[PDB]
């Protein structure tokens, strides 16, 4: 129930199964870090 509440805090599971994502948490963290890198790259390239 607690993890369900955490997941439903942002977005719903319907879209969650619509997007491919690894089950291992480490790959999720790596993809999150890469997203953050792209965030910084865009923020600095586009000002």
């Amino acid at each position: 129930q607690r993890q369900i509440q955490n997941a439903c805090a942002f977005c719903s599971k319907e879209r969650i199964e619509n997007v491919d994502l690894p089950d291992t948490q480490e790959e999720i963290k790596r993809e999150l870090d890469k997203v953050s890198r792209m965030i910084q790259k865009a923020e600095k390239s586009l000002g």
């Binding site: 993890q3 369900i4 955490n6 997941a7 942002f10 977005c11 599971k13 879209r15 969650i16 997007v19 994502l21 089950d23 948490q25 999720i28 993809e31 999150l32 997203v35 953050s36 792209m38 965030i39 790259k41 865009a42 923020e43 390239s45 586009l46």
Partner: protein, 49 residues
């Protein structure tokens, strides 16, 4: 266009977090089911005795 692409990437990172939490949900459900099977076995032993 890079700003739009990175906005999509950030929404994808929110999806990453949500998928992680749902996978945690799945793991906890599996553990609960295993404990329920243990309950079934131990109560079968209770029935035998």
């Amino acid at each position: 266009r890079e700003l739009n692409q990175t906005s999509d990437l950030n929404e994808r990172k929110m999806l990453l977090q949500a998928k992680s939490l749902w996978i945690d949900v799945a793991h906890n459900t599996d553990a609960c089911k295993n404990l329920e099977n243990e309950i079934s076995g131990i109560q079968q032993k209770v029935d035998e005795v």
